[PDB]
Symmetry: D2
Subunit: 201 residues, 4 copies
């Protein structure tokens, strides 16, 4: 297949007590899998459309592709953006640390803005720290669903899933507690790597 479901870089319960293993299992094995299957299906139907010269469902297929592929991209980044507490730095350092200071003033300012963007979403969405190639800077974006409210070319550095399935079983309606806990498992090494590769294509 074109798209494949990546394995978690750690055990399902490795992020506890911050993120329950029950959520990690359903989230990865069920939800992420659906997006991979959906993205592959969209490509197959588009191929069939070209073959038969029948583009009647083009609007449906283009949304299916965007929604599912965006879901696949977002979650693939999401898994790697996390690591068990103690297995990675508690704060960004070196180049990444300096860059965050440059575009946000301080790490605390970045956290406050990222958190506000995460908890204020009206509907399903993502809080995202991205590299803007046309501006050469790091900005925060608030995705709607998976594929809305973002410029083309945006390179994801750090992302937080704010869809209810990502926190409801453990935190219920208190999304704030979820975000506070989540900061404890952010793998700053992964973010730093993405940054190094992002600012150069």
């Amino acid at each position: 297949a074109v798209y494949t479901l990546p394995e978690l870089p750690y055990d399902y319960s490795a992020l506890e007590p911050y993120i329950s293993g029950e959520i990690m299992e359903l989230h990865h094995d069920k939800h992420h899998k659906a997006y991979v299957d959906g993205a592959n299906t969209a490509l197959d139907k588009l191929a069939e459309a070209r073959d038969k010269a029948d583009f009647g469902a083009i609007n449906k297929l283009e949304k299916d592709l965007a929604f599912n592929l965006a879901g696949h991209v977002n979650h693939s980044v999401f898994w790697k953006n996390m690591a068990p507490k103690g297995s990675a730095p508690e704060r960004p350092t070196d180049e990444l640390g300096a860059a965050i200071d440059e575009f946000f003033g301080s790490f605390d300012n970045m956290k406050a803005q990222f958190t506000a963007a995460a908890t204020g979403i009206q509907g399903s969405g993502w809080a995202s720290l991205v590299w803007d190639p046309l501006g050469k800077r790091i900005n925060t974006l608030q995705f709607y669903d998976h594929q809305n409210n973002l410029p083309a070319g945006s390179i994801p550095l750090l992302q937080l899933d704010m869809w209810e399935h990502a926190f409801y079983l453990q935190y219920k309606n208190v999304k704030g507690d979820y975000v506070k806990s989540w900061w404890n498992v952010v793998n700053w090494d992964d973010v730093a790597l993405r940054f190094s590769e992002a600012r150069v294509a």
Copy 2:
């Protein structure tokens, strides 16, 4: 400031009779300029939100940034994606040509899918040929407005503005004639350059 209005790489009337100089002037001098100002303003507002430590308008600011920055990105690519009729090959060649045949079967198949995506938009939008870094392939996407219906990380290679201001004064409601005429001014050399740089990340 952070974002600037790029100048056109050709005269305003260089794309005639395909696209009128009148549209080119309004589109570039009025419309594109507004997105640059809007994107800069969004960043300024976000900075002020950080200083005052008040993110009450975070939802508005993130949408202002996404909408305006996406408008800026989309039009910047759009201008370079075109060139006077005989200034570039009417058909893709070399690496780009082979890539199109690989992912679409043929150039004609690609044109058919791109055209269908462009003319079927329900509202304002864009037809886009992008490089998918995850699947390592070229896909067509149908953007809604400027910032919706696309996966993060999508690298724009070729884009067509389907907002009414882009064709109404010349083609009125007949979107089909606009798209047909547009193919004549596509700068495949620019698209090839974007493909080369995107493929190496």
Copy 3:
């Protein structure tokens, strides 16, 4: 103020085993309450904008109003659309029954279309049976979030909340089981009343 949180017309656990009392409490006391407060706040903000004669945040305020008021409307109908198992007929009768057969062919056909609309949503949303005043017919609509994908003037007759918070704690990712169980608690008497009042405008 202008909007108030309506009380449930039954006990929190009256819809068990179909919908857990735990979900009913969180859904009504926490989620619905937030939309009431948000809708009232949006109106207050708009009034202040009028006094100060500054509409700089008009885009944010109009979305806050639409999102929150739609959330309030949708849930208000939702609560009344349900009732304890044997408190109402398991199948529509009289005028409503005839109307369903007229616009859908049969009750089963209506259920099939409504269910497909409910389970196929890409993101948060609602499956809705509405009265179309213009066409004078009953149609099914698929709302995105609370306020998108619907014509103005649509009168809600029967609605099903497909946001993850509505079923996740009990049914997890299996949307299908949630919808199947929900049909057992539909209050057709409430739906019939809404139809009668909507048809006479």
Copy 4:
């Protein structure tokens, strides 16, 4: 057919010099017609879906229905909301006038809010004065495209088409001039009638 294209209640050039007859002709004969045809088609495909028990394209069909029907509803109201200058009151009076004063403070405040909502739209959209049945009041809403950003049950009283095709040929990018001119042709008698019938189902 279920939906039909209503005729204009006046000549195509009756609204000049405020709105050109050239725009009125394309807008009504071409654009509005497309929405009626689209709405009818959506219903036919939904009927076919139920017959064959094939709801694979349900997401596409529900959006096609919402987009086209909303477009039909919005324009049907739009045509009647206008009348040649001098043929109707320059201001709202009696019940409507008092209601506007009640929910906006004054006619001037309502105009300022409505205008701000009209010119600030990010993408295609509508500025709308609606009757809120769950609140018993008149509010202003900002529709995105035709079917987004509005609560179910909203009854349109006065609407302004802010899609570029509605003003571009005459006003180009200056949407402000279009809105200023438009106020001269508002048929307050039509709005008053809709209000009388709206506040009572």
